[model samples]
Target: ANKNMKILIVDDFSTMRRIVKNLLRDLGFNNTQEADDGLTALPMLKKGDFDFVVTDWNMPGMQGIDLLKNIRADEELKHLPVLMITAEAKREQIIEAAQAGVNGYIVKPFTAATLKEKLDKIFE
Candidate 1:
């Protein structure tokens, strides 16, 4: 919950990344970075000291679920908090993410308020 924590935003769409970045900026988190997918994100995660991750579900090369699994499996990065902000809204999908150890899950088309609430919930 540190306001100065380094955050990584993973999504294939630049537009969605921009939107999420703006929201994070508004929340007082200015230290942020981006990756196109899990394949890109994993190397960064291992090299950088990212405190939090906000990633999309579906992406080319590597998906968010796989990223989460990798993170949990990696001893060096397993402790990092991850938030899944995806459009794939299915009961099983949500359950799968939960079982995979996602810190938070928010469907796409979510409001800023809802996002903030989830962040708060995660850090609280």
Candidate 2:
């Protein structure tokens, strides 16, 4: 993964966002920002040069799956990679994210090791 890559960490809860932010920092990815939900995240992505996205599956406004779809649909943002780090671990949900073009999918309660693993794989 590019250590300088600008990543957006999207989740409704501030604590989860902080945890992911710290993990990414430990992985040498300090150029990260936060959004509480896809509603806010999409606009930020539109205005900024974001390389990757880490998002939760559920949120109050525009969940991760819809966000992923929007990203894929947007001409300018279509090429950006998205990683779904969510608590929804059902088989169908995972398939749904893959079908929607998510670059990677890791369930919640994930360790920093898994986060690193997925990041490496996504960038590979």
Candidate 3:
């Protein structure tokens, strides 16, 4: 379950971030932190030591797609797995995310089991 993984949650909604944090805690991953959006998250990400990125698709300044692109384009951060937790569920968007180097995609309003499945698919 990647129990010691240091995870960053990027979302515009605080509640949503807490929800994911709590879920990760319940699943035995305690090392977690938050960034409201990609504009802020990017610098923190580039600074180092973030093991995983769990992000929302839509945001101000920088979208999750762009964030994933930035990560993939950087040598140090490129290998970090990004799991998109977004409501943008169109087939085209999914395909686009895959092309942008998202390791996993979970549509919003998702169950923990679904998220676990996606996480396992990525990190396991």
TM-score for all models, in order of appearance: 0.97, 0.97, 0.96
Q: lDDT tens string, model 1, 5-74?
A: 9999999998999999999888888899999889999999999989999999999989899999999999
Q: How big is the RMSD of model 3?
A: 1.0
The residue ranges of model 2 lying beyond 4 angstroms of the native Cα positions read: none
Please, what is the whole-model Cα lDDT of each candidate in the order they appear? Answer: 0.92, 0.93, 0.91
What value of lDDT does candidate 3 attain over all alpha carbons? 0.91
Higher-ranked by lDDT: 1 or 3: 1
Better model by TM-score, 1 or 3?
A: 1
Clash number for each model: 0, 0, 0
RMSD in Å for all candidates: 0.9, 0.8, 1.0
Best candidate, lDDT: 2
- Model 1 TM: 0.97
Q: Write the per-residue lDDT of candidate 3 for residues 31-114, one digit (tens) a residue.
A: 998999989889989885899999999998799999999999999899899999999999999999999989999988987778
lDDT of 2: 0.93
The alpha-carbon deviation from the true structure for residue 2 of candidate 2, after best TM-score superposition, in angstroms, is: 1.2
In angstroms, the error of model 2 at 73 is 0.3
